[PDB]
Design a protein around this ligand. Structure first.
Ligand code: HDD
Ligand code: HDD
Ligand code: HDD
Ligand SMILES: [Ca+2]
Ligand SMILES: [Ca+2]
Ligand SMILES: [Ca+2]
Ligand SMILES: [Ca+2]
Lengths: 671, 674, 319
């Protein structure tokens, strides 16, 4: 609503300065028609001064990302567990804005880098903005906020030459990971398919920390936030992600923009695990430790409500670039815990917005404003957009009749710290011994992945570690991996020409936990928005008709279809020159196009076949509708995810199950 | 109230964060009742971070000032001289905002420093914001904008110790003045009563530069802007200005605030001198030279309209502190000239707002916004408040149908440079020799003051120059003063124990010009708002009765009356302890209070000092009731003196006293050099 | 010293840009001798751009103030009470910088306003800079830092018109004082001659808070800092202070400058009251409470060393 009031419409009218003076902006004022530009040319200077100052500092982490507006809807009256107003009645709706991001890359880096991903959600509640600033991975690399610049320095580019962009595959990152074993758990998630999701819509979100739900009576329970994707979970394969980074650095923000514009806004169930305060140490680790998950076997998910994203921003800079989240944006009914990672974040997010906004009044920007009245004695500051009528902004006062009133547990629905919280003991800079098991849970995670998924994780480590120059770093890395799993360390060492150290079984175990596998999570629940490329030709009229037939049948089921040919015309969306297998979730070749697969100035040598072969190699559903093609491609007609029909309607029925299966993992070799 | 849309009301409600979460802000969150404060206390950090960041850089000059909202009303359709939309119809009304200031002092320096004063006016017109950023003195110290930092560094405090505050009475300033003879004219104005005005309401405003009026057909005329005060002109005397600087640093801002709140908003006639392009060098000087005035005998003032300030800001910081004036905020119908001082100002004011605002979107602050729609392709930048719909912000485009459209002389009422302007010649860093006479106009100015005004100007120079430690600088100063006037140089040299150099008559003359004298402008046209202190006593109930009677009769003529006694009670506004003569424009003692003329309630001799100070500073003083000799004798004031009043009758006392307030100052109480 | 190495001498030489190119700065470049100024005039823009950006925000409190360099010399090896390295040997010298100030006025307000005064001392020790950021009055108005903007909004000028400058003599200040009774102790000090000292050299400095001295073995004691003036204590009277504010707004800064230039640099004995941890509530109040002094009858002063100011800054802004 502050969003609509600040929109500026330029669809009609004459150019004006920022002070409303009609002007021109196409030629400089000069002393004669071939003469020097004049200093008194105010039109030139105001325009270029604005241009000169357009940029602001990128976020220190999560610089690369994209956002959308939507709604959250409560499923029930949750007063039984929290006083939180946005959860206080069935069907209660609250507007949201969400930004998704990577962690390490600068603002112009590729979406499909391997990375932890941000999932930050703002709920504009009727008792204040509430932000959950989370990630797609439920556990974090480090156990104390003070270590965050060490982690980030080590993973960001080496500071002499600023290489490599958006990547952990260099010595410093692996030096840090091997010297700081708290990193293992998040490292294993990021080395799995969770590090390369198929889209922002196909990943989950997690608050990571344990928080508290607090009731109006003051009793509390411990919670973890989980946002569970209704689109299902899906990942790229690494070799595909690399090419995609080059062919389309905007892949995830494009995918989100497109799904929203087509009426397919993504959805999540907002859930919690809820446990009692006495269970803080009951599960075999400390709930204050952000490197641990609570297995679903010990605490099931309760569904609180529905999160839907359904409207794109109007201006990226003003909304997505300027949104300033804070876990300190908290509301009555929620409280913090003593997680030393969370505790330090509270300081950092308030402070960093001064850097980004260059002034203290960043909560006045339309995107950061609340949707309820503000009453407080904050004043002045650069960029002050309010005119305060209260000329006695201090408490206690009589000159403004004692207003604003103090709000607390008793009065004014004030935020209040959970009143059962205590502290005791020496003031110390010590890590709790309860945080010391860094290896059991990564092993639990690894155990819970399918064999193919385990192989992809080993191969991600083989790829990254083989790029580490230092032989000593590589050995130290093997030492740590070996504490999680000997087999992992053996298979990793094989690719780098070192021997693994002997098995150390202190942390080894065979336990599994549900719901962490991507491959294991069954077929996608929906195929809407998935992309089908139809490889066709203009040389045969039958090819284009076959292409058009297929189009209409696939588009009916909500698939985004691209017909590719040598050159554009009616019915053809893309040329072979601009097409690539990274652009599709499945690829169909219409038999009429068989000749392209066996040279043209219109596209690089071998392109049409390369698209089909890359798609197959990357595990995608592929087919021919009309077997010369299958033999050009070395693609066996009996393979799972390979479709060959002369019949259109049988082709499509089968192909669509392939899209749901999404990837055909039998095409990847195991150790 | 023109800015009502941005106001925030806190007359009810619970405290919230800036994101609307209700909170408390009186006690920190601690680990135990006598424990350490916690980092998770976001209530504490949000409030303190806001406080830690409240201040913004002061303006590089004119840092000390005060402002008010108003209205400008046009007296005519001025289409026949200018296309300016705000001047296009009789009675047309445009909101304004004005800020007045000193030049040299920091924030918190005293209003009544001796200085050039700013008088900056924003007209929020229906064709964009138009600013006239003027001073109370019509000529400037320097002839080229590039010399501004030199001037300002020399006047501002010495950079090793930052002494002295808000004063040109130090070596560096007079070193600059004496080495840069262009300074002489403004220097003479600042050493006159114009350097110490009685209030912002009692000074004029001037644009200083020659500008152009431009008609829709492209023809232009040369103009000077004059804002002529309807309250009259009035000054302090130096010795009063110094005491006032201590007793009430906020004298001028309080005076303006009070006049507006009492329904006595000050007024100016906004006027121009208008001359042809052909007259640029016709008056014996260059109209491009900002050190020169056009004598009113050569070009009379034309009244364009009325400026009235009638509404005080709601929040000083948000309005007065954040207002960002620019002579680059120009509208169709006005243009610049090649005055080299003006020319560089165009650059400085756009640049310096980046320092003040800390980001490029300073035109979006409520006080800076225009009152018409904005359509342009400026985007992003820190602090961006707009959400722009047009996703094609480039020209030329087809994807936004070629909008926004280019505005110019022939379409969309665009600004346009006066089309008869030309340049010719080498690209030079040279001063035009037409700028070289630095001395004739300061002499013209000096000749146009009354004998007592001339004395006051000489005495201001004696005061400041006697504080210059360098004997070499004092000598250089006398050299320049001597080129304006031998008599000035001799009279100033007398105080500083140097001989003046031999007369040099190159620039001496005896011409005079109307309208530059303050003493010579006759009685004030109005005495509304002037301050009368009535010195009484609580010892005698009849003194209080007399004070009450006098109050009723003075208030019915719109004077602001303060009754002073030993202690407060009904009928008494101020105690003697807080009272001072700098607080009044006239002083009356009620004869019941004669005995006061020791107590633990006020400093010794305070009641008499107020009366003696007021008399010595030239103010109307008197005793009401009939018994006047004890007070006048104690004070050493002659009963028959001009501006000295004694009557038994309250009615007759007030009639006479009110003539004295309009006379304002009694100049026969000041000695003149022979 | 970082200061000496960053000094810039301009007693000879030709004018240069900030990147070392010789230039002139007295006339703008124009198209013709009576023509418009050219955008290509980089000499003009670099000079004006610097001028346009010379100011920085004043301090949110204590904006009006003045400073000097000097030395601190320890009287003893204080290892028996603190591990602090600048106090570890008789005669050990540490460079200092001190800035004195008022609290409420903006940076061009008068020195002789009635107010609490700042006395902030930096010791550039051989184990890091150590700052004691104190006032000339030993107790503070409020008991919790979260109330500081309330105190400060109330004493600073009313926000609609920004009146009155540098004074507590207005409704909002007295409203706060009368609603928030913790203010009474400092109020009494500020209303006494401690609010209008004769000079920065004629006042004491106090750390105000209780701090701790920690020995290398880890034991600790509670301390209050006191800087006791060797010039004696002296104050103005109010009628005089008011006139002085107008006649010389720079009175204290001039006084300090002159005393140093004449070889009369001011001195303070740096002292502590030192008490056991067990005595935090022994004296009839809580030593965590910054509105309370420890009467010297209950804990005497120990003199640690001599603070002397003896060198004025070279550039006021930079230092
Ligand atoms: C103490 C330092 C620190 C620590 C330990 C963390 N962060 Fe953080 N985070 C920041 C300091 C920070 C920051 C420097 O303050 C950022 C950069 C820009 C911003 O607004 O805050 C930020 C940005 C940021 C963003 C992007 C928000 C947006 O899209 O604008 C997300 C999603 C996260 N963080 C999430 C996390 C999670 C899930 C963490 C561990 C559980 C975490 N951060 C630990
Ligand atoms: C080239 C530099 C330069 C030159 C030659 C001038 N000025 Fe200026 N002026 C500034 C640079 C500047 C500035 C640094 O840009 C200021 C300080 C803050 C601001 O907004 O602009 C300013 C402020 C300022 C103000 C205060 C506006 C306000 O209340 O906010 C007034 C009244 C003037 N000036 C008036 C003048 C007059 C009448 C001049 C000679 C005719 C003059 N200036 C020459
Ligand atoms: C929570 C806010 C807060 C509180 C409770 C205090 N101050 Fe403070 N003080 C500031 C916040 C502040 C500040 C806003 O952070 C300043 C302004 C500029 C700066 O460097 O710090 C400051 C400046 C400042 C200066 C000027 C230092 C200099 O000359 O540059 C002195 C002497 C003091 N303070 C002394 C005190 C004393 C003796 C206090 C009570 C025992 C005190 N302050 C409480
Ligand atoms: Ca490296
Ligand atoms: Ca900045
Ligand atoms: Ca000097
Ligand atoms: Ca007040």
């Amino acid at each position: 609503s502050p969003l609509a009031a600040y929109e500026v419409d330029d669809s009609t009218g004459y150019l004006t300065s920022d002070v409303g003076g009609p002007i021109q902006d196409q030629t400089s004022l000069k002393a004669g028609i071939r003469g020097p530009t004049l200093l008194e040319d105010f039109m030139f200077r105001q325009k270029i001064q604005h241009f000169d100052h357009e940029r602001v500092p990128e976020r220190a982490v999560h610089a690369r990302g994209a956002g959308a507006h939507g709604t959250f809807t409560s499923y029930a009256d949750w007063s039984n567990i929290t006083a939180a107003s946005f959860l206080n009645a069935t069907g209660k709706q609250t507007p949201v804005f969400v930004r998704f991001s990577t962690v390490a890359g600068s603002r112009g880096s590729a979406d499909t880098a391997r990375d932890v991903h941000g999932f930050a959600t703002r709920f504009y509640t009727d008792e204040g903005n509430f932000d959950i600033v989370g990630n797609n991975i439920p556990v974090f690399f480090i156990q104390d906020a003070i270590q965050f610049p060490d982690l980030i320095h080590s993973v960001k580019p080496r500071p002499d030459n600023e290489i490599p962009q958006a990547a952990t595959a260099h010595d410093s990152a692996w030096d840090f990971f091997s010297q700081q074993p708290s990193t293992m758990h998040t490292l294993f998630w990021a080395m799995s398919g969770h590090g390369i999701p198929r889209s922002y819509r196909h990943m989950d979100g997690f608050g990571v920390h344990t928080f508290r739900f607090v009731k109006d009576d003051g009793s509390s329970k411990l919670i973890k936030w989980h946002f569970k994707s209704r689109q299902g979970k899906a990942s790229l394969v690494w070799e595909e992600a690399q090419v995609l980074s080059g062919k389309n650095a905007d892949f995830h923000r494009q995918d989100l923009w497109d799904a929203i514009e087509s009426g397919n806004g993504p959805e999540w169930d907002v859930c919690v695990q809820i446990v009692d305060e006495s269970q803080a140490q009951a599960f075999g680790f400390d709930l204050l430790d952000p490197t641990k998950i609570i297995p679903e076997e010990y605490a099931p998910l309760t569904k609180l409500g529905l999160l839907k994203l359904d409207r794109n921003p109007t201006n990226y800079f003003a909304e997505t670039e300027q949104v300033m989240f804070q876990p300190g944006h908290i509301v009555r009914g929620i409280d913090f815990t003593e997680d030393p990672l969370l505790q330090g974040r509270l300081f950092s997010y308030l402070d960093t917005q001064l850097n980004r906004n260059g002034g203290p009044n960043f909560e006045q920007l339309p995107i950061n404003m609340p949707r309820v009245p503000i009453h407080n004695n904050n004043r002045d500051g650069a960029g002050q957009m309010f005119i305060h009528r209260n000329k006695y902004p201090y408490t206690p006062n009589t000159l403004n009749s004692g207003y604003p009133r103090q709000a607390n547990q008793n009065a004014g629905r004030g935020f209040f710290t959970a009143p059962g919280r205590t502290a005791s003991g020496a003031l110390v800079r010590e890590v709790s011994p309860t945080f010391n098991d860094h290896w059991s849970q990564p092993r639990l995670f690894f155990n819970s992945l399918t064999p193919v998924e385990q192989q992809f994780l080993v191969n991600a480590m083989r790829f990254e570690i083989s790029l580490v120059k230092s032989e000593e770093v590589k050995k130290n890395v093997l030492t740590q991996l070996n504490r999680v799993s000997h087999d992992v360390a053996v298979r990793v060492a094989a690719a780098i020409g070192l021997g693994a150290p002997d098995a150390d079984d202190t942390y080894y175990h065979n336990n599994k936990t549900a719901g962490v596998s991507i491959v294991g999570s069954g077929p996608l629940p929906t195929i809407k928005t998935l992309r089908v490329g139809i490889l066709a030709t203009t040389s045969e009229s039958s090819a284009l008709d076959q292409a058009a037939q297929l189009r209409t049948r696939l588009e009916k089921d909500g698939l985004v279809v691209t017909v590719v040919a040598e050159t554009l015309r009616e019915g053809v969306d893309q040329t072979y020159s601009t097409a690539d297998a990274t652009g599709f979730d499945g690829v169909v070749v219409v038999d009429g196009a068989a000749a392209l697969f066996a040279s043209s100035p219109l596209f690089p040598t071998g392109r049409p076949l390369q698209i089909f072969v890359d798609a197959y190699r990357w595990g995608k559903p592929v087919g021919v509708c009309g077997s010369e093609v299958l033999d050009a491609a070395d693609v066996p007609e009996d393979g799972d995810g390979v479709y060959s029909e002369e019949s259109v309607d049988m082709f499509v029925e089968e192909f669509e199950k392939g899209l749901a299966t999404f990837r055909f993992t039998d095409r990847f070799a195991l150790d």
